[PDB]
Amino acid sequence: MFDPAEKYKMDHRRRGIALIFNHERFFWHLTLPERRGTCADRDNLTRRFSDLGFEVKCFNDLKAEELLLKIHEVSTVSHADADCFVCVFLSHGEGNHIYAYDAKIEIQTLTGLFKGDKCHSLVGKPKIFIIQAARGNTNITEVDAASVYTLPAGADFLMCYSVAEGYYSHRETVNGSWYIQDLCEMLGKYGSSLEFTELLTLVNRKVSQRRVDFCKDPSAIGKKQVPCFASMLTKKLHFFPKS
Amino acid sequence: MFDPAEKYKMDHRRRGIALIFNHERFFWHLTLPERRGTCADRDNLTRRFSDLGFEVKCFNDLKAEELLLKIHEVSTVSHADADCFVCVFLSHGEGNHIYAYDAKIEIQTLTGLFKGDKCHSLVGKPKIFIIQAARGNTNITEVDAASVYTLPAGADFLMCYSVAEGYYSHRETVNGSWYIQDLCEMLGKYGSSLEFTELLTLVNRKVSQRRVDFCKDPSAIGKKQVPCFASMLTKKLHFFPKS
Amino acid sequence: MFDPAEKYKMDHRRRGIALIFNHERFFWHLTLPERRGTCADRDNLTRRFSDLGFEVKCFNDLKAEELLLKIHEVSTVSHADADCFVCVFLSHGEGNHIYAYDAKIEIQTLTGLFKGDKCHSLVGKPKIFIIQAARGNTNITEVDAASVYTLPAGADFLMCYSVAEGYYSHRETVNGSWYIQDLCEMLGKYGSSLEFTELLTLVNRKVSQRRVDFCKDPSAIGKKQVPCFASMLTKKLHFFPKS
Amino acid sequence: MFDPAEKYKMDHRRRGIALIFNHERFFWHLTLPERRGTCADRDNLTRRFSDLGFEVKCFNDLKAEELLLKIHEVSTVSHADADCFVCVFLSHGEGNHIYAYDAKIEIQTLTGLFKGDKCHSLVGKPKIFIIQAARGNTNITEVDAASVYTLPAGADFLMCYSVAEGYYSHRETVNGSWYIQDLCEMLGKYGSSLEFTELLTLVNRKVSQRRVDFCKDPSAIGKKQVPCFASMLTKKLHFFPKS
Amino acid sequence: RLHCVEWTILER
Amino acid sequence: RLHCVEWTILER
Amino acid sequence: RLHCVEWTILE
Amino acid sequence: RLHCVEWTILER
């Protein structure tokens, strides 16, 4: 009956959609600081996923209303001829909440639009969410404390988190987030050959190895960054080049 | 100087210690139901980890302070001699807490004992926590709603969860828990060959594919179980047999 | 210098405004049960406060939007020629929040509007909030459990609550809430004479004496109701007849 | 029929016990600052309650365990021939917790011992808890932020708090706490005449009108202190002298 | 002015 | 199907 | 060594 | 009787 070698069927005519929600600045009253260098993160991801065959859709500084409307559409479109779905969040976050330009949205509400009864054409297919979200405090490295609860979402969901609780996220104003940089480098070199979770495990090593004990910003000597992923996948996942 | 297939050195003379905390009944005032079939899980886990070379250490129904006291010891002895460390929790739980016989213990204070600074001799070595814990209400299948937050803890930590939020855990009174049963079956067959996260992925599928029979219980139709795991590991993890 | 007989100056040409936000039903998705009998409460309060000299302003099932606008208006108008302010909330509530028709408001943002900084014309004047709010489940007695934190609001703030934690609020579908009935009966008989906190103490006794021993609804036998008030008043408070 | 002037029968042969728990220093592991001046408060309260006929019992820097045993003893001894019960807490506190020398206790745990069912000799009798407690940071004035929730306790309970949320508590190293000083002065002059809640309202005014020099502190200019009290009393409370 | 601090989307 | 779950009041 | 950080009373 | 609801592990 059972096959340990079993793998997600990745031979559909399309790879699928890669949503990216990029947030650089926010509503004044939120008093959330600018996330300079997020554009670098956004464009790095856009192409790496394009090279993997994704139809990338970027949205910049959307308001909670536009974002929910847009992400509800993507979820209501047919994904039958797609391998999988990808959704990326670059913003500030807290506990169970991510920030859109002007308000906050529960992450579960977002992920929840793609679970089995709500999105039939994705049932059995990998649903991958990548979250670069933390708490607000010439290339400068900024340090944010972990804020967003690193939970799972459901069957065949793969939740990828830039940083784990008790650790610190890093973003350079020109180069971009440590997590996104390393993830993209790995996606570039091993995306088309490595099983995705093993590629994510690489990113874990690379980011946790980025030294933080000899800075030029004395306010962050010791603040290690260690990412994590919560997997609910049930099969091996490869992004082999499509024929 | 970068290896995409780098592995944890499982070279050491010993595999390491496998700690198992089995909780069957509880303090009258906690008003928590018995967990019949947990001993079957305990024994199943005992055999499979021994076969993988672990020095299995079981404790039944230890009180909070007994448990704390015991785990604290295991964190303050040398593991420099070993490949890794395993800790299993079989009890009730809620949010960030797990239940010892008479009191709640914060998971984070349990894993924290084994972090890189409090336990030098496990620095760089896989620290694996396996948690079968939920909220309570011949062979009977009991159904419990997910309660324990599926969180991660630290670098080179691997948190394995029997069930994620919105799903239900199952325990047969004679054969034990679905999660445990399935995990132990994968260990028996593939434990000494497969990369450990890939194996847990197998467990994800095996459990998620478990249905019931409409007549065994009227109140358990469509209460599916989807386990998950939060990886903080930085390399590949195999349990090839030691010489 | 110091006079224990000191009293709030109640000789302004107007007694002041008594705001009543009445709430019977709620937006479907909040799944909040109807509060039949709340109208009997609203009209009961409208008379007793009118007879005391207040300009009563009732509002029914306002959406959070309208409610905030309305209460913000009242807070921005001059109260220089008023003795005091009264605000009454008849709705469901939870923790630090109350429910408008469609959403939830933090009670502190509601009281905060009338604080010294935000409302100079009410400085040194009594600000009384009356809250009949709890958690939802022919004349029928319904029994809700206490859900709203009975906290004070600030200097010269008098916060009055229908029920305290560990106790149950009651409302009759025809005669109204136990709290509002008793409060209105004491207002009618003693409002124009008794010091207000001593009248409130009467309501405490009356409500706490209402028998829950021989119920037609034996679900609610022994579910006692005890009100309370948190006082940050600095002077005696009388509503003697004006002129 | 019904007495708007009705009062607690204070003609029992004894007034009752006054329980004072004094805490000036703490277990090193709690990292809680000393409370210089708390002894001045203890001594002040002691004499003011003795003069009101109370049998005062002071306990200094007890540990959670001894404190609980000791208050459980007072809760289980007969108060049948007593007028009421007074318990005072001088220490650090946070949210719902007060601190004993080595651990925190829930206020509800302390108050719960004297509720109708658990204490029978005190039923229908005024139970008064006075709490000077806040967050830790020649005569000196120290400023601590409000930290202890100001909640009620049950029928015939009077909960008195030194400071309300958003305000700051003050304690002089020699004279003692602003709240305690002002309370003891009011007790001395009006204690055996005025209705106790109205006497607390006096204390509200006296403390709320206090100021620092702004000549000895630049780091406390504008931090006002306003106490409060949560009443669930059901009658008038007086301490007229006894025969 | 008014501001919703949190938005969700419902499935009517 | 859009829905605010909490409103607050602001100034400028 | 071990230390309770919060005590209560049962029964 | 007395009951600990939370235990910590001391440093000294």
Tab-separated table of N, CA and C in Angstrom, chain A residues 2-4 6 115 150 152 154-155 164 167 186 190 195 198 201-202 204-206 208 226-236, chain B residues 2-4 6 115 150 152-155 164 167 186 190 198 201-202 204-206 208 226-236:
chain	number	residue	atom	x	y	z
A	2	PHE	N	1.668	1.413	1.039
A	2	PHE	CA	2.321	2.677	1.358
A	2	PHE	C	3.664	2.873	0.654
A	3	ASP	N	3.902	4.097	0.189
A	3	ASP	CA	5.114	4.412	-0.555
A	3	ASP	C	5.839	5.613	0.046
A	4	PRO	N	6.925	5.354	0.791
A	4	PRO	CA	7.736	6.421	1.389
A	4	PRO	C	8.300	7.375	0.338
A	6	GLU	N	6.681	8.498	-2.121
A	6	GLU	CA	5.559	9.252	-2.679
A	6	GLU	C	5.800	10.762	-2.692
A	115	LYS	N	-7.944	26.380	2.383
A	115	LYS	CA	-8.109	25.039	2.934
A	115	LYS	C	-9.111	24.229	2.116
A	150	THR	N	4.482	31.411	15.298
A	150	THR	CA	4.854	30.510	14.214
A	150	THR	C	3.997	29.248	14.213
A	152	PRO	N	1.095	26.505	12.327
A	152	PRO	CA	0.627	25.827	11.113
A	152	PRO	C	-0.772	26.294	10.707
A	154	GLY	N	-2.989	24.054	8.150
A	154	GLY	CA	-3.837	22.935	7.780
A	154	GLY	C	-3.161	21.921	6.876
A	155	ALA	N	-3.918	20.904	6.476
A	155	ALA	CA	-3.395	19.831	5.638
A	155	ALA	C	-2.675	20.364	4.403
A	164	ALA	N	12.099	32.779	14.860
A	164	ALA	CA	11.338	32.104	15.904
A	164	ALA	C	11.324	32.932	17.184
A	167	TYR	N	14.075	35.128	19.356
A	167	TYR	CA	15.169	35.466	18.455
A	167	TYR	C	14.861	36.761	17.711
A	186	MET	N	19.343	30.172	-1.843
A	186	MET	CA	19.093	28.736	-1.855
A	186	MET	C	18.114	28.361	-2.962
A	190	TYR	N	19.466	25.688	-5.496
A	190	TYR	CA	18.964	24.346	-5.214
A	190	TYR	C	17.449	24.212	-5.343
A	195	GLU	N	14.567	18.857	-2.382
A	195	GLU	CA	13.244	18.763	-1.782
A	195	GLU	C	13.067	19.993	-0.901
A	198	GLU	N	14.075	20.415	2.798
A	198	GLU	CA	15.514	20.271	2.981
A	198	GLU	C	16.235	21.532	2.524
A	201	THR	N	15.690	23.877	5.346
A	201	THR	CA	16.607	23.513	6.420
A	201	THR	C	17.981	24.127	6.169
A	202	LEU	N	18.347	24.250	4.896
A	202	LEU	CA	19.572	24.947	4.526
A	202	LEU	C	19.505	26.387	5.006
A	204	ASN	N	17.797	27.630	7.306
A	204	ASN	CA	17.938	27.620	8.757
A	204	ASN	C	19.401	27.718	9.169
A	205	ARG	N	20.231	26.863	8.581
A	205	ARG	CA	21.657	26.847	8.888
A	205	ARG	C	22.319	28.177	8.544
A	206	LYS	N	22.043	28.672	7.342
A	206	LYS	CA	22.688	29.877	6.834
A	206	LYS	C	22.374	31.110	7.677
A	208	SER	N	21.138	31.161	10.842
A	208	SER	CA	21.577	30.974	12.220
A	208	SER	C	23.094	31.081	12.336
A	226	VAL	N	17.148	32.786	14.260
A	226	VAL	CA	16.925	31.397	13.889
A	226	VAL	C	15.517	31.227	13.337
A	227	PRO	N	15.414	30.918	12.038
A	227	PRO	CA	14.116	30.749	11.382
A	227	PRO	C	13.525	29.391	11.717
A	228	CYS	N	12.347	29.115	11.176
A	228	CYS	CA	11.723	27.814	11.342
A	228	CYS	C	10.626	27.640	10.312
A	229	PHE	N	10.238	26.394	10.084
A	229	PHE	CA	9.057	26.111	9.289
A	229	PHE	C	8.198	25.075	9.997
A	230	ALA	N	6.887	25.274	9.936
A	230	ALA	CA	5.942	24.311	10.471
A	230	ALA	C	5.307	23.585	9.298
A	231	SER	N	5.589	22.292	9.179
A	231	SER	CA	5.138	21.533	8.022
A	231	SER	C	3.928	20.659	8.315
A	232	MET	N	2.928	20.748	7.446
A	232	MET	CA	1.782	19.855	7.513
A	232	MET	C	1.666	19.102	6.192
A	233	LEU	N	2.741	19.146	5.409
A	233	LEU	CA	2.812	18.435	4.139
A	233	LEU	C	2.774	16.928	4.362
A	234	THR	N	2.374	16.192	3.331
A	234	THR	CA	2.199	14.750	3.445
A	234	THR	C	2.999	13.993	2.391
A	235	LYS	N	3.678	14.736	1.523
A	235	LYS	CA	4.489	14.138	0.470
A	235	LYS	C	5.770	14.933	0.261
A	236	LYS	N	6.734	14.326	-0.422
A	236	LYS	CA	7.956	15.027	-0.793
A	236	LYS	C	7.623	16.119	-1.804
B	2	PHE	N	30.197	25.188	1.280
B	2	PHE	CA	28.787	24.983	1.588
B	2	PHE	C	28.294	23.644	1.049
B	3	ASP	N	27.695	22.844	1.925
B	3	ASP	CA	27.176	21.535	1.539
B	3	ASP	C	25.663	21.420	1.726
B	4	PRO	N	24.917	21.386	0.611
B	4	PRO	CA	23.451	21.300	0.632
B	4	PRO	C	22.942	19.960	1.156
B	6	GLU	N	24.600	18.445	3.910
B	6	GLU	CA	25.310	18.294	5.175
B	6	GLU	C	24.444	17.612	6.232
B	115	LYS	N	18.795	24.323	25.596
B	115	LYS	CA	19.329	25.288	24.641
B	115	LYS	C	20.853	25.382	24.727
B	150	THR	N	1.290	24.483	18.656
B	150	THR	CA	2.356	23.791	17.944
B	150	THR	C	3.526	24.736	17.699
B	152	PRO	N	7.688	26.108	18.101
B	152	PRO	CA	9.090	25.678	18.096
B	152	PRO	C	9.849	26.270	19.291
B	153	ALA	N	11.126	25.933	19.465
B	153	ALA	CA	11.855	26.406	20.646
B	153	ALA	C	13.240	27.032	20.378
B	154	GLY	N	14.136	26.317	19.699
B	154	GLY	CA	15.481	26.835	19.493
B	154	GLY	C	16.249	26.216	18.342
B	155	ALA	N	17.428	26.759	18.055
B	155	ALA	CA	18.259	26.231	16.980
B	155	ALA	C	18.495	24.741	17.201
B	164	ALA	N	-2.657	19.629	14.991
B	164	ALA	CA	-2.602	21.083	14.894
B	164	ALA	C	-3.961	21.719	15.169
B	167	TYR	N	-7.990	20.732	14.555
B	167	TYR	CA	-8.105	19.299	14.320
B	167	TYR	C	-8.228	18.541	15.636
B	186	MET	N	6.339	3.820	11.323
B	186	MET	CA	7.308	4.389	10.396
B	186	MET	C	8.723	4.208	10.930
B	190	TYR	N	11.318	2.429	8.636
B	190	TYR	CA	12.176	3.393	7.952
B	190	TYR	C	13.052	4.225	8.887
B	198	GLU	N	11.575	13.775	6.769
B	198	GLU	CA	10.869	13.101	5.687
B	198	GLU	C	9.972	12.016	6.270
B	201	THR	N	6.957	13.417	7.838
B	201	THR	CA	6.074	13.762	6.734
B	201	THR	C	5.248	12.539	6.355
B	202	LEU	N	5.882	11.370	6.397
B	202	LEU	CA	5.169	10.119	6.179
B	202	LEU	C	4.092	9.950	7.245
B	204	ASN	N	2.624	12.400	8.884
B	204	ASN	CA	1.592	13.371	8.536
B	204	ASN	C	0.540	12.753	7.628
B	205	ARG	N	1.001	12.061	6.591
B	205	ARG	CA	0.106	11.452	5.616
B	205	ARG	C	-0.672	10.289	6.221
B	206	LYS	N	0.047	9.377	6.868
B	206	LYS	CA	-0.561	8.185	7.448
B	206	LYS	C	-1.704	8.547	8.392
B	208	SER	N	-3.295	11.643	8.635
B	208	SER	CA	-4.303	12.446	7.946
B	208	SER	C	-5.229	11.591	7.085
B	226	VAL	N	-4.709	15.898	11.808
B	226	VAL	CA	-3.560	16.295	11.013
B	226	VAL	C	-2.420	16.729	11.926
B	227	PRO	N	-1.404	15.868	12.073
B	227	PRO	CA	-0.255	16.207	12.913
B	227	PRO	C	0.582	17.268	12.221
B	228	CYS	N	1.608	17.767	12.897
B	228	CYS	CA	2.551	18.678	12.265
B	228	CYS	C	3.865	18.672	13.024
B	229	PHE	N	4.868	19.332	12.461
B	229	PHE	CA	6.146	19.470	13.139
B	229	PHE	C	6.802	20.805	12.809
B	230	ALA	N	7.422	21.407	13.817
B	230	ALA	CA	8.113	22.676	13.649
B	230	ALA	C	9.617	22.445	13.698
B	231	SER	N	10.275	22.590	12.553
B	231	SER	CA	11.705	22.316	12.463
B	231	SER	C	12.573	23.558	12.638
B	232	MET	N	13.611	23.416	13.453
B	232	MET	CA	14.594	24.467	13.655
B	232	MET	C	15.954	23.885	13.310
B	233	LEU	N	15.949	22.647	12.825
B	233	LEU	CA	17.181	21.944	12.488
B	233	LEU	C	17.957	22.667	11.393
B	234	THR	N	19.271	22.472	11.383
B	234	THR	CA	20.132	23.160	10.430
B	234	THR	C	20.838	22.202	9.470
B	235	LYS	N	20.536	20.911	9.590
B	235	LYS	CA	21.143	19.888	8.737
B	235	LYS	C	20.199	18.707	8.514
B	236	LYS	N	20.691	17.679	7.824
B	236	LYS	CA	19.929	16.450	7.613
B	236	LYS	C	20.067	15.515	8.812
